[PDB]
């Protein structure tokens, strides 16, 4: 006698996308999203961090007071940007452990300088050189004081400067290395000099070395740069019989979030939390392949250039109606799961809202349950190097390589696990909907094996509606259905 068909199904799209799971090398899903940020605009955004463009100046030359760097006096920054075109244009110098001086100043974030009056009676102050023109005059580093003989004498200097405040003082000083003995004795009378800078807890003595170095900006002489931090209640003592390059005061040294970066990218007007030497990048994705060098709230650097996170179910092409065993339904556009029927009123279709929402709710914000937010990092270690150095650089490189391989592994496993779970939970909602419909129908229907029920009674549009609504009363139809099912 009289029967009807009720099929259960899920949607499908014509333009699917491939992802990887624990189970499958490649499986097509209806939708996915990229987790690796792989592009930049190429500009460093000037908000929200305070960006200071070094332009023609390294941080160290701005510290010492090279004349063409005079504009940087007493400046501050969150990120100091060093350019590849920068150059020195003052007295030729070197800094033992230059990388550490550059690092601790960059981290402090300020060039604020406070003058102090040392008692330099007995010597002449403010020596200058034609290698260090300020305007048209011979000059010198603005923060250093080149001392030399007065009236053919250089007495032994022995000078003190207490730290009577609440904060550490950073003192920058140096030692002059003459090219010849005639140069040495013309300036310091004595044939050999000595420079001792000490505190209660520390001391440094340096003896200059007389001899020719290769000509730089007209000079074979050199200055070596040193530094001393004086804690509150300690005392700076400077002791010299010649060749001392005196400080003119101290730098205020702070703690905080400041750092330094080498980059030639232009600075632009926008805001962006994450900065790389390539420019700023968005941080909406958890991973990035733009540059292992970062500043700010940044995605984690990984080796992969793409990781696709599934955001929808398996995509299965559409092969009497038929249900989910065979294929997906490209014609279902207003839900993820639903019903099709054929009965005496024709054929029709309707979406299931609840099962659709359950799948969307589980997929929404899935990655955040494991990586909630991006970590902010500020001053770190250097990661590129322009000179061969051996033991310490080997270690710096190994530390960073180790870190990147472990985060790359985490990223790969996370995406495969999460995608496996997306397939499993969207399959599971389909099955739950089918089973729920099966128990509603009791003895009034049989499973045809293709995702559909043969309903063994007349079942018009209202009857199909009551099943979708969950209000179908199997008792109303059981007598008719048993009669149809169990005849012979």
């Amino acid at each position: 006698n009289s029967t009807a068909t009720l099929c259960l199904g899920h949607h499908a799209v014509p333009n699917g996308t491939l992802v990887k799971t624990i189970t499958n090398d490649q499986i097509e899903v209806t939708n996915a999203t990229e987790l690796v940020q792989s592009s930049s605009t190429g500009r460093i955004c000037d908000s929200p961090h305070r960006i200071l463009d070094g332009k023609n100046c390294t941080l160290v030359d701005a510290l010492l007071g090279d004349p063409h760097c005079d504009g940087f006096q007493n400046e501050k920054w969150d990120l100091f940007v060093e350019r590849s075109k920068a150059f020195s244009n003052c007295y030729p110098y070197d800094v033992p452990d230059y990388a550490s001086l550059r690092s601790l100043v960059a981290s402090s974030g300020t060039l604020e300088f406070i003058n102090e009056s040392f008692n330099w009676t007995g010597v002449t102050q403010s020596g200058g050189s034609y290698a260090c023109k300020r305007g048209s005059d011979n000059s010198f580093f603005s923060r250093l004081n080149w001392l030399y003989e007065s009236e053919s004498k250089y007495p032994v200097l022995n000078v003190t400067m207490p730290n009577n405040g609440n904060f550490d003082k950073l003192y920058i000083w140096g030692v002059h290395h003459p090219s010849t003995d005639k140069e040495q004795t013309n300036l310091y009378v004595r044939a050999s000099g000595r420079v001792t800078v000490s505190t209660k807890r520390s001391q440094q003595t340096i003896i200059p070395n007389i001899g020719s170095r290769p000509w730089v900006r007209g000079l074979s002489s050199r200055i070596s740069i040193y530094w001393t931090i004086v804690k509150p209640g300690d005392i700076l003592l400077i002791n010299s019989n010649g060749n001392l390059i005196a400080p003119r005061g101290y730098f205020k040294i702070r703690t905080g979030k400041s750092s330094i970066m080498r980059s030639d990218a232009p600075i632009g007007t926008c805001s962006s939390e994450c900065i790389t030497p390539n420019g700023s990048i968005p941080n909406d994705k958890p991973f990035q392949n733009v540059n292992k060098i970062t500043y700010g709230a940044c995605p984690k650097y990984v080796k992969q250039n793409t990781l696709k996170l599934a955001t929808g179910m398996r995509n299965v092409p559409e092969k009497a109606i038929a249900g989910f065993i065979e294929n997906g339904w490209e014609g279902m556009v207003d839900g993820w799961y639903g019903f099709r029927h054929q009965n005496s009123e024709g054929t029709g279709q309707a979406a299931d809202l609840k099962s659709t929402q359950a799948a969307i709710d589980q997929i929404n914000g899935k990655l955040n349950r494991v990586i909630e937010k991006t970590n902010e990092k500020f001053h770190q270690i250097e990661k590129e190097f322009s000179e061969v150095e051996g033991r310490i650089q080997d270690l710096e490189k190994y530390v960073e390589d180790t870190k990147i391989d472990l985060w790359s592994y985490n990223a790969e496993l996370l995406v495969a696990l999460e995608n496996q779970h997306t397939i499993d939970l969207t399959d599971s909602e389909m099955n739950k909907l089918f089973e729920k419909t099966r128990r509603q129908l009791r003895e009034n229907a049989e499973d045809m094996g293709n995702g559909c029920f043969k309903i063994y009674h007349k079942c018009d549009n209202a009857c199909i509606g009551s099943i979708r609504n969950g209000t179908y009363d199997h008792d109303v139809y059981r007598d008719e259905a048993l009669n149809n099912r169990f005849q012979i």
Copy 2:
């Protein structure tokens, strides 16, 4: 009347607790346990490790033999505890690479010192100073020998000490830095001194520095400390024409589990494997947020202060009997899963032991399948710093920060995966029990859709017992049930 109802259910509690899974931001379960240790008693337990309280003494001052540290002569430790109140009270000194000498002695774990007879003929031994009082006498570091002129002469010292033993020897020696030339020549005759300590394979030469330093305990002079390790079959040679602070012998240097920690926590009578600067902590949990500085068998340091691991099923409160589709049963207190029935004898309930034990067995020891035990660590790297240093300290901080972010990621993912699996395995035990009952019943029952069966025959308490027992014989009742189901 002619039928009975049999429902399958699981327990529920009135006081559930919220956890995170791969699927859900927050889901209530019946029971959970804390995986981050976040408190301490505040005292360092004196068992099972040998604790040595430095009291007023740094390890380096106990090594050198500052008089107020004389009680530490020949001591040993598993963990040396350095107090912030410690102070020096002898000749003012510094140590180039101070951190490395503190580290290597801390790691060796002993101050065992062995006297040797160096041949100091030609000079006076045992110089002392009012800056270094031992009792009522001017004195000096007990393990060092301050040499100076005898009868207004200081010959070139040239002395040897072979290592004819089976163990490395550690020699601590020094160089005296006078304040003035009058001081220098009064002690050492020459206007300039020199100290060279060498082995077959290594050498160190130090030239003293004459000049004024700030007064510490009455003195502007200083000593610098140096060290030399001599291997079996090697030879120590000490060569000096002035300013040498000689060793009196060597320290035995061992390898093993000893270390050093900065802490102001009191030492108490108790036992604990894990020590932090805050006090000892339990190690029953896998992670801790008390301090990244630890010694012994310790939980792993993470940034989270709470991680909740589910130890029970989803909690669904109890809102005609009904089964697990609707809700959980708070009235079920002797098992996790069970049966309720309604029949001609009224209503009853009983727990299923086998499904209950299977869920408990899977949850028991769950975390230990991945992290079995806690790692024991001894001497590590420093992780707090009182001075600005630049490159090397940047690297130490970055190594530790990298480590903590990776373990913190591991802890978050592990708790999310494990909790998802606890929900899944406990849902699965409920489903398996329902299906097993479904198949026992054959054609004698229908599923009502709510976790219950309508049994289509008289089924008294003994009859319900036979289903729970697994001994129900469907054939005994089939005729009666088919007649009631199909009215045939």
Copy 3:
């Protein structure tokens, strides 16, 4: 008979193997595979990397040109192997920061040397020593030039060498430390010498130290070794008034994949991508416990000595036919899942190929979806050390320990997760095959509860085949089966 029995089952084996999952401490499976490489052949394979056996020579003695290392002149390598028997046989020397010099040369991969003509007019070249015989003559390091007085004079040397090419130059030079003043003035006329080597960007000054060191190969004198790298467009300048040990030219310095390893394993004819100090190892497994020191494309080092990855389903001993609810089938040796039946023509067994392939396809290459290939590492950090050093060595050890604990955790979790997924997916294929058969049979069969169906009609060998085929037409038999099922 008027009925038949069709059971569904999976295979089992008599020799199972134990593995660990997220759920089970130990569960027996049909097959597993070892993921930790723990053995080696003990020989270093000479393909595909260029191996250079140091034999009696350290890399550094081969660089300087110790006469018994003359054979290594201008040599090159991918991996330089240093032997524990190596010895020095020339002038006794030391290298401040020896480890960095060894590291940067090992990394460069070449001893290619280019003689340059320095202007030493005014002094005598090519000093030699009976501690350094070449043949029967007193001699010296081949790449160094021992300068000394000519005609009782030693003028101040001031000598230049530009880099006018496109590649960096590495210069090795030294300073002679005499034992006595008579030696010093006999060689260099002056009572004290000094050596300054400088570029536009750097300077190094070393003052020699006169005094006795312990006798080595007849001499209490020593040479100290130093190095300088010169960039294109820079200039080397050597300035000395005595004690200079001059370079004879430069070493070409390259970048690439080269390194150095300490090992006493013999070199043999074979190929292997991965080298350890124990010998070469296979790299087909993802992890290894042979040695944390490796070179090339190697498995990752872990602490575990065994990790078993399941490659088959749960193994259940075979306890009239019965299906999968009870046990596995040891007698099914041609498939993983299958059918057993009893019907009017007898009893039989047949494998189901499609479900067997689905499980095998999912297990095949499962580990590669997460760790696709082996990482190639070349020059890294040192990981064993023969001298006590303190801070830097503490950090090298801690970096390596940290890495190994994180990877050992990654390995443990991966194996437990994957094994859980292998159990789950093979359980699932069995269930899917049972449900597929249930739905083919419609009203013609009942589930007996033990993994078998009672089919309520005559069902000969062809009929059973149509069920295994997916082509069974339930309508053909429905009248006969309903009559048999339903009767009072």
